[PDB]
Each structure stands twice: as C-alpha cells, then as structure tokens.
From a paper:
VPS35L has a long N-terminal extension of 180 residues, which is absent in VPS35. At the VPS26C binding end, the N-terminal extension contributes two additional helices (α2–α3). The tip extension (containing α3) provides a putative additional binding interface with VPS26C. The very N-terminal part of the extension, the N-terminal tail, is predicted to contact VPS29 and reach all the way to the C-terminus of VPS35L. Retriever itself binds CCDCs at the hinge between the R- and V-coil that forms a 120° angle, forming a large surface of mostly charged residues.
The Commander complex, a 16-protein assembly, plays multiple roles in cell homeostasis, cell cycle and immune response. The recently discovered multiprotein Commander complex is a master regulator of cellular homeostasis within endosomal transport and the trans-Golgi network. The complex regulates cell signaling by modulating trafficking of transmembrane channel proteins and receptors to the cell surface and diverting them from lysosomal degradation.
Numbering used by the authors:
A (entry chain L): 1 to 108, 442 to 627
B (entry chain O): 1 to 37, 110 to 963
C (entry chain K): 446 to 631
D (entry chain N): 1 to 182
E (entry chain P): 1 to 297
Amino acid sequence: MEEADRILIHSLRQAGTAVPPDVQTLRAFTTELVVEAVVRCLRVINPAVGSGLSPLLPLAMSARFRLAMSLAQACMDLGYPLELGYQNFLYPSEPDLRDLLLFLAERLRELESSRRLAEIQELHQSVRAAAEEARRKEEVYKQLMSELETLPRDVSRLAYTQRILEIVGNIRKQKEEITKILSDTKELQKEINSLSGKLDRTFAVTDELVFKDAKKDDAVRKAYKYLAALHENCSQLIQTIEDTGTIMREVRDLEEQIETELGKKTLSNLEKIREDYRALRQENAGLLGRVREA
Amino acid sequence: MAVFPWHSRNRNYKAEFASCRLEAVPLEFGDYHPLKPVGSDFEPWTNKRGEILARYTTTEKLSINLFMGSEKGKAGTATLAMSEKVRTRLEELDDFEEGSQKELLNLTQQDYVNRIEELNQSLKDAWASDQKVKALKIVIQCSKLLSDTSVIQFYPSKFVLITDILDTFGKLVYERIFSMCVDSRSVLPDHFSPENANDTAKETCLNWFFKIASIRELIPRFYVEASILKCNKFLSKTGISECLPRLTCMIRGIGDPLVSVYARAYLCRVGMEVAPHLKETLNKNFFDFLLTFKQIHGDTVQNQLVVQGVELPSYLPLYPPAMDWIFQCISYHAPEALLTEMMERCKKLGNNALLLNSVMSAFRAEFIATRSMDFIGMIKECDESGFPKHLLFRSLGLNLALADPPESDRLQILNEAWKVITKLKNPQDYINCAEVWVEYTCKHFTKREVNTVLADVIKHMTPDRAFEDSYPQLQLIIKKVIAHFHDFSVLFSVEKFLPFLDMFQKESVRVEVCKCIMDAFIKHQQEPTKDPVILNALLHVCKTMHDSVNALTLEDEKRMLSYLINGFIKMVSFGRDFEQQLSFYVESRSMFCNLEPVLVQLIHSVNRLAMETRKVMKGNHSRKTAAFVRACVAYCFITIPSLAGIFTRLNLYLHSGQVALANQCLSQADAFFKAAISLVPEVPKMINIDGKMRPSESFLLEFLCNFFSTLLIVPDHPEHGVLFLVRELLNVIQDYTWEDNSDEKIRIYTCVLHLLSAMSQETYLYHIDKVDSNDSLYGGDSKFLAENNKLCETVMAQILEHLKTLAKDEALKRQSSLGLSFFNSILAHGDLRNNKLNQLSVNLWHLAQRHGCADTRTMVKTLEYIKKQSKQPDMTHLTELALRLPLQTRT
Amino acid sequence: AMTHDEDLDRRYNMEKEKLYKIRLLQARRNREIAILHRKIDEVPSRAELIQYQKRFIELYRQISAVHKETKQFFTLYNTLDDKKVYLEKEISLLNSIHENFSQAMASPAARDQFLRQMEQIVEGIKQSRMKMEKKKQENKMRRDQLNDQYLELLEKQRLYFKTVKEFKEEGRKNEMLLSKVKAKAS
Amino acid sequence: MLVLVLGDLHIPHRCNSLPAKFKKLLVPGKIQHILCTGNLCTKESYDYLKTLAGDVHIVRGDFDENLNYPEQKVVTVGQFKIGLIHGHQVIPWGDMASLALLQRQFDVDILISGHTHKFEAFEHENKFYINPGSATGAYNALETNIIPSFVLMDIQASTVVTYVYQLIGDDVKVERIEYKKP
Amino acid sequence: MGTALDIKIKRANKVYHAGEVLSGVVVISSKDSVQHQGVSLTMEGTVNLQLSAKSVGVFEAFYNSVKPIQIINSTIEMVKPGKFPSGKTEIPFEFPLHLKGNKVLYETYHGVFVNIQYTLRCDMKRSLLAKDLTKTCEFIVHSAPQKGKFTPSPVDFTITPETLQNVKERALLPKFLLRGHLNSTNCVITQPLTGELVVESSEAAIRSVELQLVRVETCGCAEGYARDATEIQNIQIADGDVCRGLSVPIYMVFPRLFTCPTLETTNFKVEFEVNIVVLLHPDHLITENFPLKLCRI
C-alpha cells in the first residue's frame, strides 16, 4: 500500500513513535510497538482513557492480556464495526490493523491648479498607505522568518502530487484501453452475427446438397455420415471451449481466494498462537502448582 | 521598418465611470413599481366484451358440427298449395338444417372464431344480396350455435359473439324496415308514430314477425324477437313495453340456466339503452330471477354437473359477467332502499356468496359501505364453494378503497378481514386479494397496521420466486404506501420496509421503486437537512444503485438517474457540520465514481462551501480555516484528473486557479495550468455532442479571453519567468495546428494585447483584497515594460504577415474586418503622437480600404465617431490623424 | 500662481518617483514574502494528508479491481475471438467440402479416394478436438487441485479460529488462576 | 411593453432559490419578454420562467446546458435596440471601448451583459451599455455582498422607463432610469 | 316482342269485407308500346270442398268432392280495342260483392279439405303483334263484424299422469303435476291467444314441450261427411329442465289465413283445435287437445 506504506512513516512522525527508516511495512512491526503508539495516541486523544496504561511493555504475558483487553474496551467506547480483542491485537492481517489505525487517526490654469491639488492629495494618501504596508510587510516578515526557523523539514506537497499524477496516468490509460476493448467487443459481436447468418445458410445448402446426391449413392450417404460425425465433432468441441473458458474464470476466482487467505496470513499466525499456547500452558501449569501450594 | 513603438494611454476608472456612469434615481417608499399591487356512467358493452373475450377461454377441444344450406335448396315434387307455399317460405329457412353439414372437432379458439366469421360473411352477403330470407336462415344458424352449450366454459364467448353479430343484424333489420317506411325524401324521425309505418312496410314487418312467432324452437324465437322489439317502434311504442313483461313471462320457458341468464343480460342491455321504465321491468325480471336462482340450486345444474363431472369452482366463473352486467343495468341509479330490499331477497335465498360478490362489485359504494358491517356477518354466512370469500374480499377491497364506513367500523373490519386474511396460506391467492385491500389499508390505517401487514406478507413469501413473480403487486403496494405516506422519517419508523427492500433481488425493479421513492421525496421533501439514520439508509440505497450500474446500461437513462440522485444531494445539509460534511463528500466521491455530472455537482458543493467559508471568516482566518482551504484544494484537484471532459476540466483549472487566488495555492494554480496547456494538445479537431460534431477552436477561444480576464490579475514569481509560462502558453498555442481560418487565433492575440494594455498601467483595474497588482512587483519601467512591448511588437509583425497573406488569400472581407477591429483595439490606447503608430494607423486604414472590400460605410460612421472622440487630448493626435486621414471606400 | 503650480507639480513628481523607489522596495519584499509563503505551503498539513491517503486507499481498491476486470474481459475477448476463428474454419471447410462434393462423384476410384480422405479428415479433426478435450480435463484437474487446496486452507483457517478460542480459554484460565493465587496465597 | 432582465443566478450550484421577496415579486404572463444573460445551469428554471411567461430570449453561459443558446443576440423594439451577451462571450470585463466595438460588430445601440458581477450602466456618448450584476448575489469574493439586483423596464417609443432592484433583506431597494432615445 | 299485363288490387292485402265495394287496377307494362283487341276481367269467389280421398274412398271422394263452388262471379269488360304507352297503362274495374254466384260470400280461406278462395281472371286480347294474354289473381274477402259480439271464454286444465284419458302409456309417463289455462278459448281469427301453463311437479326432465295447432276441415257428400284434420303450428317452449312450481305462458298470433272462425255448414265443416305434445328428457309423451271456436269482429 505504497503511500500507506509511507503513511507508516508519516503516522509515526505524527505519533512521535520511533520511526526507524528500516520500518517500511506492517510486516516490520512488533504488535508491542504498535500498542506503544496506541498508548501515545490514545493518551493524546483521550488521555483519561489513554493515560490509564503505561506505554511500557508488560513482560508478564497476563499483563499484556489485561492491558490489551483494556484497549479492546477503549475501542468498545466506540462503534468500530469490527470485533475486538487481544487475539486480534497479536495477529491481524495488516489491512485489518491499518483499517483500525485509521479509525484511530480520525479522532485527533484654474482646472490645472485644481488637478495639481487632487494629484498631491492622492500622492499623500498613497504614501500613507505605503508606509502602513511597510509596517505590515516587515512584521509579517519577522513572523515568517521565525516560522521558517521553526519549519519542519517534512515532505513537500509536490512529491505526493507527483505520485498522484503517475497513478492518474496509469488509471486513465487503463480506462482508455478498456474503451478500445469495448469497441472491439462490439465489433466481434457484429462479426459473429454475420457469421451466424452465413453459417446457417452454409449448412442448409450443404445438408440439402449432400442429401440430394446421397439419394444417388449409398457411398454418398456415407459422405453424409462423414458430414454428421465431423459436425458433431465441431459442436462438441465448441461446447468444450465454452466449458474450459468458464473453468479458467473460476480458476482465477480460486486465485483470488489464494490471495484472500494470503492476506489473512492465517497459518503463520496460527503457528505463532500454537507455540504461544504451549508457553501459556506451561505458565498455567506454574499457576496451577502455585494454587496447589498456597 | 522596425516595429512602431506602441504606447498606451492610462485610465482613471472612476473618471471613466463618472463620464460613462448613469447616475440613476433611487426610488421612494410606496412609490409605484411594476409589481406594486343512457348516461355514460353506464359502462359500455365493449369494455365487458373485450375483457371477457380475453378471459373466458376454455380447455375443451372445440367443435363445429352443423347442417348448412349455403349452396342448395329444395326442388322436389312436394305436395304444396298457396298456404303451403307460405309454409315453403319458412322451409327455405329449414333447408340449411335439412342440408349437409360442416364438421370440425377439437377446434382451437381461433379456428372457431374463423369459422364463425365464415358464417358472418355468409350473413353479410345474404343481407347485401337482399337474401333477407337467407339472412334470417343464417341468424337461425346463430341461434342454434347458441343452442350448443356443450363447451360450457367457452360458451360465454360463443354467446358474446353471436349476440354481437345478431345485434348488428337487428340494427340492419331496423334500418331496412325504416328505409321501407322512408320514401327516400328524408329519413323519418325516431319518434315516428307506429301509424307512420306505411301499409306495405307494416305488412312486410308483420310477415317477418309472423315468421318469428312461427319459429318452432324457443331459442331463435325469443332471442330474435328481443331484437325485433326495436322494430316495434314501427308498430307500437307501447308494444315494446307490453312485450317486456311478456318476455319476462316468456323467459320462464328456458330451464337452461346459462342461456336464460344471458338472455336476461341481453334484454337488460337493450332495456337500459332504450328507456328508463325498462329498468323497472328489469326489476320485475329480477323478481323472476329469484326463482331462477331457486332452480339454479335445482335439478338441472346437479344433473348436468354429474353428467360431465364438471367442478362448480370451474362452473362458477362463467356467470358473473352476466350478473355484473345486469347489476350495472339495475343499480346504475337504483336507490339504496331498493338495493337494500334486493339484498333482502338475496339474503332470504341460500348459498348466495357469488350473488353477494357481484352485488358488492356493482352496487354503489356508500350503500355497500354502510352495509359493510352487516357484510362481516353475511359474508361469514357465505361458503367458499358458493363463492370464495377471499375473492369477496378482493372486490370489497376495491369497494373500500372507494368508500368506507365510520372509523370505528373501519377498525372492526380491519380486525375481521386482516386476521381472517392472515389465516390464508396460499401466498398467491393471499397476495392477489391482499394487494387490492392494501390501498384502502393505506387509506385509513397507520404505521403499526402496516407493520403487521408487512410481517404477514413477508411470512407468506418463502417460495420467494413466486413473490418475485408477484413483484408487480409489490410495486403497486409500495406505490400506494408512497402516495399515502407523507413523512420519510416515519417510514424509517416503520423500518420493516427496509427488510421489505431486502426481500427483493431484481435490481431494476428495485430501482424503479427507488425512482418512485425519490420523486415522492421531491414532492414531500423540499427542505435540505440531515438525519443520520435516514441518511445512512438512503446512502445504502445510493450504494445499491451506484453499484447496480454496469458500464453497459443505457447512457441517457444513466444520465437521468444520476440527475435524480444529484438532486437529492442538494438536500444534504448538516448546517455547521463543516468537516463532517467534508468527510461526507469524501466518502461520496470515494465510492460514487460512476458519473461525471454527479462528480461535477459534488465539486460545486465543495466550492460553494469553501467560498462561503472564506466569505464568513472575513479576515478572521484561523489556522483551521487555512487547513480547510488547502484540503479543499487537494480534494477538488484530485477530482480534476479523474474527470472525463477536457474542456470542463480546463475550466476547472480556472475554478481551481480562482480559488487559489481566493487563498494562496499559487503553485497549485501553476499545476492546474501546466495541465491546461498539456490539455491543449489533447484538443481534438472535432468534438461530438448529441451525436453531432462541433469545432473546438471557438469554444476554447471563447473561454480563453475570459481566462485572460484572470491572467493578468495573477501575481507570480521570479523563480519562474513571472508568467514565462504565459508566453510559453501562447507559444504552445501558436504551435498548435489551427486552421488558416483561425484568424480567430489572431483575434485572441488582440485580446492578449488588450491584456498587455492592462499590463501597461501603473495601477491595474480591479483587485481582490490580498491580491493587489503585478505592476508594482516588476516595477513598470521601460526596461521591463519593453519586455512585454517587445513581445507585443513581435506579435504585431506576425499580424502583419498574416493580414497581407489574407490579401493574398482573398480573405478580403475577413482580413478587412479583422484589421479594422484591431484598429479599434489600438484606439483604446495607441499613441499616434507616436507618429510611427500614427503611420501604422494610416497603413491599416488605407490598406484595408485599398481593395474596396472593407465596409467603408461603417468606416465612415466609425471615423466620424473617431473624429468626435478625437476632441479628447491624446485623441488630438487622433484629431490630426483623422483629419489628415483620407479614406478609400466602398462608398 | 504659475510658480506655485510649478512647485506643486515638482514636489508631486518628486514624491511620486521616490514612491516608485519605495514600490521597488515593496515589490522586492513582497517577492521575498511570497517566496516564504510558497516554501511554507510546500509541506501541507497532515490533516489533509489523511485525505491524501484516503484517496490513495480508494485508488488501491479501484485500480486493483480495474486490472482484474481488465484481465477478465481481455481474455474473454480472446476466447470469443478464438471461437470465432473456429467458426471461420468451420464455414470454410463446409463450403469447400460441399463444392468439392459437387465434383466428388467422378469415379469409383474417386469415390474410394474421397471416402479415404473423409476418414482421414474426420480422424485428424477428432485428434485435435480430443487434444483440446484432454486439455479441458487438465484444467478440470487444475480446478480440482485448486478447489481442494482452498477448502483445505479454509479449514486450516477455521481451525485457526478455533485455536484462537482455545488460547483465549488458556488466557482466561491464566487470569482465573492468578485470581485464585491471590485469593489463597496472599 | 414589459420586458424582464436578470443576471446569472447559477441556480443548482450557487443559488438554488429565488429570493423570498423575489418569489413574492413573481408575476406570470405579464412579461412580454423574459431576458437573462444565462449561466443559471438549469433549464428547468427556464422552464419555470416559460411558465411565468412563454417569451424568453436567451444566451448560454459557462455551464448552462443548451450551449446552442446564441453566440450574440439582439432584439429591437420600438425605437430601441437590445443586444445581449454573457460576458464570457465578450471582450474583457472592463475595457470600455472594446466593449463599444461589440456594438459595431453587431450594428446595434446597446448591450446587456450580466457577467461582470456588479450591476452596471455606462455610456459616454449616444450609445449605451448596461450590466445587471447578479439577481441572486451569486458567488464571487469580488463584491463583499451582492445585494441581489435586477432591472425591469417598460418601453415607450423614444423613452424607456426602467426599474432597478436591490435586496438587503425585507429591505428591497429600487432605482429607476429613463432612456430618452437621447 | 311480347307484352306484360298486371292486376293491382288497391288495398295492399287484397282483402275485402262483406258489403264493401271491390276495387282493383289492371296494369299493362312493356318494353314496347301496347295495342290490344281488348282487355277482359272476371272476379270470382269460391269454396273448394276436397272430400278426403281415402276418407270417402278416393274415386267417390273426388266424385263427390265439391270442387270450387263459385261463391260469386260477376263479369265485365274493361278496355275495348286500344293502343297504349309501353311502360305503364292502367284502366280501372270494379265488381259487386253480390250473389252472382252460388253461396253467400264467405271469407277466402286457404284450408285443405275445405278451401275457400276469391280470385280474378283476366285476358288482354293483344294486337296480333303478340298473343292474347290471360292472367289470374287471388285475393282475400273478410267477413263483416259479426252480429253476436265477442266475449272471452277462459278455460283451465290440470295435468298429471293420472289425469290422462285412455292413454296407453300412463304407467310409462313419469310423475309430474301441471296446470294449464287459456285466457279466452274465444279468440279472434286474426288476433292473439294468451294462456298460462304451470309445471309444478316433475320426476323427469324435458327436452321438448310443444304448443301446437290443428286445423280440421270436413266436406259433405250425399251419403256422408268426411272430416279431416291437419296440424300446423309449433312453438317448442323447453330449453333446460323446467323448474317445478312455475307457470309458463301460452302465446299465439292466430295463423294468418290457414285458420278461420270455426265453420259448420250443410256442405262442409271446418273446426279448429289446440294440441299439446310434450317430449320429455326420458321422452315419455303425453298429449291433450282442446277444440276451438273462433270469431271475427
């Protein structure tokens, strides 16, 4: 999500969270660092909510559970459409987290002499205004210089504007190609319609002719049998064509589904939760021993 | 020669105002100002007939099996005499039945129609051939076709057609006898006395009438005699009346229920048409009809149904057409007391349910409505096999939609009908009757009653494909809702309509309803506002329609629908919810890509907002206002590339520019304009609108001077050529492959020179608060002023080249008009105390005149006016010029 | 007055040009200020940048679909064209055959050769057709593999959600264990 | 003779309502000619005008939709001429004499214009040119407040009586001029 | 070329009454103008007594059969040798309804066994350009309004299978109850009958209920009178099974010339009757007759 990848940086800067330039995708992130920024920004938006928990990592897994559950509740304050909970907070698809994070980002002679008189009066008024403007310019300038001094060395409007320009060109290209394709579609339909008419006549003639001369000789009846077998071959193969094309469409659908689970990242996070569960059972066995011993 | 050095005048715009201004009169309180202050309610047979002929097909394989005598007749040695010769006249009418037959089993509807029409032509010929005896033969054939009831469900249609044919026949008969009465001097009046029928016409009518009385079979004799009753006008006006109760008694002979009923229906049509008292005799016929119903329970129906095995539910549909015609005939202006007494007899009768149905159908709504409470009981008295009570419901729903008892009674009846109706499981029949009742339900009852109906119908839909078959009903239903329903929010209070929408599947149908919905909204809603929940639902539907749209739909329909959508969009009005409204825009855009005009008008909303926003802030501009501004800037910008229409997008560069002037955004200005110029190559030679081709050069040029109106106002930047780009712009223009006809290009060049005349001032003409004037920035002085002068002089050279080429072109009218217009441009400012420009002006004047094509007449008008202007000070060198000017002429 | 008038215009002109010099100062400082404002504008507000990204996001969605459809209907057209090509060959062979049929009866040796040729033609056509049918079955198996893998991983996903529930039980268990620990021990 | 004159009102996008008092002013039928310099952006409004009086003479503008609406038009009645433009169609806003040239282009005696946003009246010698700025006060930061303004006139031989409207709230102000065939 | 001649009787019915004057026109009509040695015309009235051939015995029947007795014959000549325009010529004649004949001027009656006629016979002795023409007309005489004035004679009859007299089939006839009525068994020759007829029980449906007339005519011979009846009317008044307990009406506009007041004479008799025949759905058949005596006024 190229620009959203860049918003990783922009948002980190916006957060003041560490912005390691090597951190360039949600793939990079510890959920811990994500949550640290969560603490920062909630404590910004609702300090009463956000200040309640330290940005420091809880080493105690249970404390991680509990704090994250509190984050879930903080979201429960609000009508986010999605399900909440620490299970999510560990292992989302990066879109899902992205989506939520944006849901967060939401919330931050006579006449001659007389004319000399008018001339000089106007010049007087003009000089007055010019002096005033000198004051305006310089105090503004002083301000502007102090601002220039403060100015963040942040990215210019242009860079994004260019990315935009590129994107636009690509898209419009697409739609143009689309348009020609649409025409081509129409053309092929016209061609096929003509083909239908000529082919219909072609068979009517061919069938009639071969029938007539097949009357003259059973061998020409075999010629008619050849025609039938070949024509059925054609009709069958045409059907097969239709079938295969459809099949490959569904193949692409399956490919979409491949990508779908790939975005889900299901199995890897599953392996993670499994080994986590192993650790947590060991932990719980410690707790069970302690409950026995107390 | 070097190019003559142009110098402009300089203007005092207030002085130029004072000299030009109308110093108008302010007007006074209360002073005058321009705005200072049978009857046609008897529905015709044709309608009934058409509908019946549509419905009453049958499944039975039709047949025609009839003796005929079209070609042949007697010639044998029969024993006859004068009396028997008179009998032989009728034997002619017999001979078709003595004749051989045409036989056609298992006819379809149309084959039967066609054979009946064959007989129809035979009759038409017999009439036209004056074979009135043979015409009578064929009419007897019609009556025997009436005799064959065997295909009983089709048979009503048979009756219909035979009655239509024999009606025409009776008309023809009356006209013939009248023509016999008429001596061809002029036609006798309709009120003619029976004595006015002359002796021979009387005796001829008597002969045919005696034939009729001598008809052996009841069916021809009665039915034809009903038509001859018209001929009674020849013979006795009172005889008509005498015959009608006589016919009433005569009708008693037919034990066949269908024939007798339909005979009565025919006689009712006739009687109603002829005169009022005939309805009273029809009341007498109804008195007979009570006994006819008595027999209708009796042996004939039972025996025949047993013989064929026909189902009464199948049997019942055949009669209501006759019933309803009769009921129209009497009830047309029957009093409520009379109709009530009639109901008394009907209630005295048994198994009356179909009678009740036809009663409710015909009889008048106030009368029916008052009784409607009684009908609760009396319909409970009914039996579905006497007549289906839900169909009673449906007819009644028509009735109630028309008129209703008191509101309490409405409430009770609501309970009775709906609760009963909910019991009814067959969703098709359920929906059939319910959809009728829906309109009346909408008429009186409210959101909860509606919600109840909603629930029961939604439960009844489950074989939903049948519900989808029943889409038309649902459509009618919701239209009723709409017409009846006048608060959108309360629809949302119903909510169940939303699941109702959810039940649907067919996009287009849903869309049709959405159309209805929004126009109704347009009627009731006239006020722009917000309700987030209402909004969310609406926007869901907006989504629904937008995404419903494929690339392929009909362009103009797409257009109109978009228009419709765009209209409600103006309603979107949060008040002070600026950033919220902003976000709303954002989403709207972010989905609703699908039609440019929608986008256009969205951007309008953006612009309108931002414009007012600055207007309200009045210099009090917060940092928020700046961020708001720049966000708007981006948003609108990012639209622009996505948009289709190049010209529109170009003026959007204009809009974008002028708003950038409204605040900051000057580099963004430049961006719009780099794009603009890049769009200049993108200009096609011809442009299609409405399917039609138009030449772009006008439209762009047409723009471009309005754009000049801007172009000098803009301050820019020595980091660039301060409007190098504008030169560069003009360069691209000149590079662009205009026609030789694009002298208009040069006209624009002139306009640019008008701009440069503006550049020439020490102070520009008019200004916006925080954008003052470029003149100061470079400093006006001969070195930088000469930069633009130089450029002008360059274009001047170009001008001269082209114009004299136009002389080479024989574009002489074009060239002369152009040059003199340019002269008139010079006239705004050209120093001709600069003798070099002065000579230039001489060159133009005479060289244009020299070939005589110049409209010198206008030039003389022009130059006398220029001498009049020459009085003025700079114009005193124009005074010297125009006095010195000779003038070559057309004149 | 003429001396007075001359003095008035002289003074007027003097201050006029001095004001022009001031106007050059002011133009210069205006240029500087405008430059600064340009520089200020160049880095826009993140508030806006949010919409920038929103626009990008919608673009990502839109464009990805666009490309998808592009491929879909591109190949669709390829397909329709290919089938059209077979229509073309079919018509060509039919009419060529029927005309040759109008010639074909020349002799029994010609009869023999003709029917031999018809045998060979229909055989080769069958060969090609069957090649394409085998190719169909190949794609069918392709679909089988893909579908099965999908359903497999669909279960792996549902199982994973079950594992999510399982661990949530383990964590709830953990916290309850902690609760008893503090109740009993502390 | 009653003739109505109004500037660009840009209805759907800038100004979706006739002013309430201007609504109150509506008088169907009595208008012999309804004249607007365009750029209303909805013909449905024009259709409403035609329902006010079926005698409308029109030019287009910016995104008024029947761009088939003239390039230049003139009507002459009694002793006066009436030539009309939407300014984008014409030479720039305020070049007074080039905008005098326009009349010679056509051969007329007047022009009405409605594109420049103020309401304007200007002649210096014989032949006169007028602007009715915007009867809806349509968008432009230009004027701080376009108190919405329109003129309507009665035509009488060598004279024209003109009424000249302004809107401030329940304050509507009016001017009147006569043109003398001077 | 030939010629046509025609006889017009003024009263379009050719009907004349006792004591009237008789009036007629003779028409000559031709493609070519007409000349004749004369035109000659007879008027006649007759009763024709056809003793029924088998009833008397065929030879004796015809021997005795009093073949048209000239009621009246007066004879006149209308045009002497004369020459006339082609398309029309018309000359008038009258004859006296006075006993230049055998019997006192009966009404023309086209019966069967008794027939009564009034007739004319014409000859034009055409110029021998063409043959003499002979032509005949027949015309009706009506009786004068009778000395004995009319009064109506209502009669009723009731029918069930048991009511029936000498019916072979009484056991065959199914259950029913009926009552029949004639509003006046006194009726005028040219004028209408009214009657009521109830069905008020039936075990059986019906396909035909017939309502029928018989004319009965008798001729005399020196040894015997022979009496013979013919039937000519039907209205069949059943379609569908007749409702029990209802009355149905009887209608007749008495048959134009085949019927007369009931006649009884020394030489001949003519009596009239009404007949009933019912064809049930099981078609057990029942029949009743009543005889009629008829009047003219």
